[PDB]
C-alpha cells in the first residue's frame, strides 16, 4: 500500500467506495441530513479519483481515518473533531447511537416511490442507506450493500407489475426485518470485540466455523477464523471501505477452495459478489464425517495432554473446541464456549498438581448439568409459547423480565421482551435436535440489546452484572434472576392510563405494543399481581378499545369510558 485512498477506489469500485463512504459518515453523524453527507460522499468521491490518476497528489498519502474524519469535521461532533487521531475516530466509535429518537419513516404512496426511482434512481437508492445507516450504526458494511441491492431489484421488478402496492410492499416489510435482525445480531459481534476482546470472538468463530464445516481441517478453520476476526474488527472500528474488500476475498478464497472446507457451497459460489459472501455467511451446517473418533482419547486419556497443552494452550485448547464443535451442531455456540473454558480451567488447577490424570479423567462429567441447563430452558419455554402464542408469549415474558429487572425503561423492556417472545416463532418449529443453536444464539443477540439499550443509562445493577460478568454465560445470568424484592412501586399516573382514538387506526404491530406498554406500567405499579391478576385486567382494556373503535363520536367514548376503567383497575 502507497496511497491508501485509491487502492480501495480501484478493489470495490465507485458505486460501493461512493456507498460504503455513505454508510460511513451515515453511523458517525447521525443528526446530520442527507444532502450535507451527500456533498462529502461526493468530494471524497472526486478527490479518490484524482489520487486514482497520480499516487504522487498532495493529501493522497493520509490515512482513512484522517481522510475521513477531517472531512466529517468540516461539518456531539464539536467534541471529537477537537481532537487528533487515532483518540478522534474512538470519540466517534464511543458516540454511536444505538436508539438515536429518529422518527420511524413514513412511506410516500408507491407510485410516488416507482416515480423518484425511475426520475432519480442515484438518489433514491441513497437515501436507502442513509437512513438505515443512521439508525443502525453498527450495521455490517458489505451486508447493507446487499440490503441496497435487493431494495432496487424490489422496485425494477414490482414498479413493472399490474399490482405494485400488492408486489411491492410485502417485499419492502419482509426486508426491513430482515434489517432489524441483522443489526442486532451484527451489534453482538461488535460488542464482543469491544468489551470482551479479540479473542472473545475467535473462540466464538472457531466454535459457529467448526459447527459449519465438520470435514474441514482445524488449521483450514483457524485461518477462516484469522481472517473472519480481522473482517468484523475493520467493520466494528469504523473501517468500512477495508472490511468489505477483506469481506469479499474471504468469500473468493473460500469459494476457489470449497473441497477443503465444506460441500454445501455449490449454490452459493455461484452468486453475484453481494449474495456470494451473505449465502456462505447463512448457509446451512455441512454433514459432519462418519468416521471420527470419541474425543476422550488425546484429550481426556492421553499421556501428554499437559506437555501439548503447555506446548501451545491457545492451540491446544483451539483444537479441543474445534473437534468438540463440529460434532455437536445440536448444542449452540455460547454452550460450546462454557464448556471450552469448563475443561480449560481443568487443566489450569490440575496441571499444577503431581497427579493429573486422577483430575483431569473426569473432566466430561462436569458438562452434563451444563448440557441439560438450556436444553430444559427450551423445552418449556417453546411449551409455553406454542400453548399461548406470540403475542401473549411476550405478555407472560413481559410480566417475567418486568418482576426481574422493574428499573429498566418501559421502551427497553416492551422492546426487548417483545424481541425474546420472537424466539418462539424463529426456533420452536424446529426438531428438538436443531432448537438450541437457534434459541441460545438467538437470546443471546436480544439480550445484548438489553444490555447495550441499558449501557449508557445504568438504573439496574443486575443487569450491569449480568451484562458484564461473562459475555457467554450472559443468558444463564438473566435466567437465573429471580423476581426483585427490593422494588418500590411506582405511584399511579393518569396519563400513562388515559388512552385516545389514536388506538383504532394503528396497526396490529403498533397497536400491541401501545397494550404491552400498560402491561409494564401495570406491573411496576401493582407488582404482586399474578400472571392471572393482570390477564382481567387487560382483559377488559381490550374490550373497552373495542367498543369505542366502533363509536360514532371516539374522542367521548376514549375519555368518558376509560377513567371508568382505571377506578375499576384501581379497586381490584
Ligand atoms: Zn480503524
Given at each position: 500500500?502507497?496511497?491508501?485512498?485509491?487502492?480501495?477506489?480501484?478493489?470495490?469500485?465507485?458505486?460501493?467506495?461512493?456507498?460504503?463512504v455513505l454508510?460511513?459518515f451515515?453511523?458517525?453523524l447521525?443528526?446530520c441530513?442527507?444532502?450535507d453527507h451527500v456533498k462529502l460522499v461526493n468530494e471524497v468521491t472526486?478527490?479518490?479519483?484524482?489520487?486514482?490518476?497520480?499516487?504522487?497528489?498532495?493529501?493522497?498519502?493520509?490515512?482513512?481515518?484522517?481522510?475521513f474524519?477531517?472531512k466529517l469535521?468540516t461539518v456531539?461532533?464539536?467534541?471529537?473533531?477537537?481532537?487528533?487521531?487515532?483518540?478522534?475516530?474512538?470519540?466517534?466509535?464511543?458516540?454511536?447511537?444505538?436508539?438515536?429518537?429518529?422518527?420511524?419513516?413514513?412511506?410516500?404512496?408507491?407510485?410516488?416511490?416507482?416515480?423518484?426511482?425511475?426520475?432519480?434512481?442515484?438518489?433514491?437508492?441513497?437515501?436507502?442507506?442513509?437512513?438505515?445507516?443512521?439508525?443502525?450504526?453498527?450495521?455490517?458494511?458489505?451486508?447493507?450493500?446487499?440490503?441496497?441491492?435487493?431494495?432496487?431489484?424490489?422496485?425494477?421488478?414490482?414498479?413493472?407489475?399490474?399490482?405494485?402496492?400488492?408486489?411491492?410492499?410485502?417485499?419492502?416489510?419482509?426486508?426491513?426485518?430482515?434489517?432489524?435482525?441483522?443489526?442486532?445480531?451484527?451489534?453482538?459481534?461488535?460488542?464482543?470485540?469491544?468489551?470482551?476482546?479479540?479473542?472473545?470472538?475467535?473462540?466464538?468463530?472457531?466454535?459457529?466455523?467448526?459447527?459449519?464445516?465438520?470435514?474441514?481441517?482445524?488449521?483450514?478453520?483457524?485461518?477462516?477464523?484469522?481472517?473472519?476476526?480481522?473482517?468484523?474488527?475493520?467493520?466494528?472500528?469504523?473501517?468500512?471501505?477495508?472490511?468489505?474488500?477483506?469481506?469479499?476475498?474471504?468469500?473468493?478464497?473460500?469459494?476457489?477452495?470449497?473441497?477443503?472446507?465444506?460441500?454445501?457451497?455449490?449454490?452459493?459460489?455461484?452468486?453475484?459478489?453481494?449474495?456470494?459472501?451473505?449465502?456462505?455467511?447463512?448457509?446451512?451446517?455441512?454433514?459432519?464425517?462418519?468416521?471420527?473418533?470419541?474425543?476422550?482419547?488425546?484429550?481426556?486419556?492421553?499421556?501428554?495432554?499437559?506437555?501439548?497443552?503447555?506446548?501451545?494452550?491457545?492451540?491446544?485448547?483451539?483444537?479441543?473446541?474445534?473437534?468438540?464443535?463440529?460434532?455437536?451442531?445440536?448444542?449452540?455456540?455460547?454452550?460450546?464456549?462454557?464448556?471450552?473454558?469448563?475443561?480449560?480451567?481443568?487443566?489450569?488447577?490440575?496441571?499444577?498438581?503431581?497427579?493429573?490424570?486422577?483430575?483431569?479423567?473426569?473432566?466430561?462429567?462436569?458438562?452434563?448439568?451444563?448440557?441439560?441447563?438450556?436444553?430444559?430452558?427450551?423445552?418449556?419455554?417453546?411449551?409455553?409459547?406454542?400453548?399461548?402464542?406470540?403475542?401473549?408469549?411476550?405478555?407472560?415474558?413481559?410480566?417475567?423480565?418486568?418482576?426481574?429487572?422493574?428499573?429498566?425503561?418501559?421502551?427497553?423492556?416492551?422492546?426487548?421482551?417483545?424481541?425474546?417472545?420472537?424466539?418462539?416463532?424463529?426456533?420452536?418449529?424446529?426438531?428438538?435436535?436443531?432448537?438450541?443453536?437457534?434459541?441460545?444464539?438467538?437470546?443471546?443477540?436480544?439480550?445484548?440489546?438489553?444490555?447495550?439499550?441499558?449501557?449508557?443509562?445504568?438504573?439496574?445493577?443486575?443487569?450491569?452484572?449480568?451484562?458484564?460478568?461473562?459475555?457467554?454465560?450472559?443468558?444463564?445470568?438473566?435466567?437465573?434472576?429471580?423476581?426483585?424484592?427490593?422494588?418500590?412501586?411506582?405511584?399511579?399516573?393518569?396519563?400513562?392510563?388515559?388512552?385516545?382514538?389514536?388506538?383504532?387506526?394503528?396497526?396490529?404491530?403498533?397497536?400491541?405494543?401501545?397494550?404491552?406498554?400498560?402491561?409494564?406500567?401495570?406491573?411496576?405499579?401493582?407488582?404482586?399481581?399474578?400472571?392471572?391478576?393482570?390477564?382481567?385486567?387487560?382483559?377488559?382494556?381490550?374490550?373497552?378499545?373495542?367498543?369505542?373503535?366502533?363509536?360514532?363520536?371516539?374522542?367521548?367514548?376514549?375519555?368518558?369510558?376509560?377513567?371508568?376503567?382505571?377506578?375499576?383497575?384501581?379497586?381490584?
Open positions: 500500500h502507497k496511497s491508501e485512498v485509491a487502492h480501495r477506489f480501484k478493489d470495490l469500485g465507485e458505486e460501493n467506495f461512493k456507498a460504503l454508510i460511513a451515515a453511523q458517525y447521525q443528526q441530513p442527507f444532502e472526486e478527490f479518490a479519483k484524482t489520487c486514482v490518476a497520480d499516487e504522487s497528489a498532495e493529501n493522497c498519502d493520509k490515512s482513512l481515518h484522517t481522510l474524519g477531517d469535521c456531539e461532533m464539536a467534541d471529537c473533531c477537537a481532537k487528533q487521531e487515532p483518540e478522534r475516530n474512538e470519540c466517534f466509535l464511543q458516540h454511536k447511537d444505538d436508539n438515536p429518537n429518529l422518527p420511524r419513516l413514513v412511506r410516500p404512496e408507491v407510485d410516488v416511490m416507482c416515480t423518484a426511482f425511475h426520475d432519480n434512481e442515484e438518489t433514491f437508492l441513497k437515501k436507502y442507506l442513509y437512513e438505515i445507516a443512521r439508525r443502525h450504526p453498527y450495521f455490517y458494511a458489505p451486508e447493507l450493500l446487499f440490503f441496497a441491492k435487493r431494495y432496487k431489484a424490489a422496485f425494477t421488478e414490482c414498479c413493472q407489475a399490474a399490482d405494485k402496492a400488492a408486489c411491492l410492499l410485502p417485499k419492502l416489510d419482509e426486508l426491513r426485518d430482515e434489517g432489524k435482525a441483522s443489526s442486532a445480531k451484527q451489534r453482538l459481534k461488535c460488542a464482543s470485540l469491544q468489551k470482551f476482546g479479540e479473542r472473545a470472538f475467535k473462540a466464538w468463530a472457531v466454535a459457529r466455523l467448526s459447527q459449519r464445516f465438520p470435514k474441514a481441517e482445524f488449521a483450514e478453520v483457524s485461518k477462516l477464523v484469522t481472517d473472519l476476526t480481522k473482517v468484523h474488527t475493520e467493520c466494528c472500528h469504523g473501517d468500512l471501505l477495508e472490511c468489505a474488500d477483506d469481506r469479499a476475498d474471504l468469500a473468493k478464497y473460500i469459494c476457489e477452495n470449497q473441497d477443503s472446507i465444506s460441500s454445501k457451497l455449490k449454490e452459493c459460489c455461484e452468486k453475484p459478489l453481494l449474495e456470494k459472501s451473505h449465502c456462505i455467511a447463512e448457509v446451512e451446517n455441512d454433514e459432519m464425517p462418519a468416521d471420527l473418533p470419541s474425543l476422550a482419547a488425546d484429550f481426556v486419556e492421553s499421556k501428554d495432554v499437559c506437555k501439548n497443552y503447555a506446548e501451545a494452550k491457545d492451540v491446544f485448547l483451539g483444537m479441543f473446541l474445534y473437534e468438540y464443535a463440529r460434532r455437536h451442531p445440536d448444542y449452540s455456540v455460547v454452550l460450546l464456549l462454557r464448556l471450552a473454558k469448563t475443561y480449560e480451567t481443568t487443566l489450569e488447577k490440575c496441571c499444577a498438581a503431581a497427579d493429573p490424570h486422577e483430575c483431569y479423567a473426569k473432566v466430561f462429567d462436569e458438562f452434563k448439568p451444563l448440557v441439560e441447563e438450556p436444553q430444559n430452558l427450551i423445552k418449556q419455554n417453546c411449551e409455553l409459547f406454542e400453548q399461548l402464542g406470540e403475542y401473549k408469549f411476550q405478555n407472560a415474558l413481559l410480566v417475567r423480565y418486568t418482576k426481574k429487572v422493574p428499573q429498566v425503561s418501559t421502551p427497553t423492556l416492551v422492546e426487548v421482551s417483545r424481541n425474546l417472545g420472537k424466539v418462539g416463532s424463529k426456533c420452536c418449529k424446529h426438531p428438538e435436535a436443531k432448537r438450541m443453536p437457534c434459541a441460545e444464539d438467538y437470546l443471546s443477540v436480544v439480550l445484548n440489546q438489553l444490555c447495550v439499550l441499558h449501557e449508557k443509562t445504568p438504573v439496574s445493577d443486575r443487569v450491569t452484572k449480568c451484562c458484564t460478568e461473562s459475555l457467554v454465560n450472559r443468558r444463564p445470568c438473566f435466567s437465573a434472576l429471580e423476581v426483585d424484592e427490593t422494588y418500590v412501586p411506582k405511584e399511579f399516573n393518569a396519563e400513562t392510563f388515559t388512552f385516545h382514538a389514536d388506538i383504532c387506526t394503528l396497526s396490529e404491530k403498533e397497536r400491541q405494543i401501545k397494550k404491552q406498554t400498560a402491561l409494564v406500567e401495570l406491573v411496576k405499579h401493582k407488582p404482586k399481581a399474578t400472571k392471572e391478576q393482570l390477564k382481567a385486567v387487560m382483559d377488559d382494556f381490550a374490550a373497552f378499545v373495542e367498543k369505542c373503535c366502533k363509536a360514532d363520536d371516539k374522542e367521548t367514548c376514549f375519555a368518558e369510558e376509560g377513567k371508568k376503567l382505571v377506578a375499576a383497575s384501581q379497586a381490584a
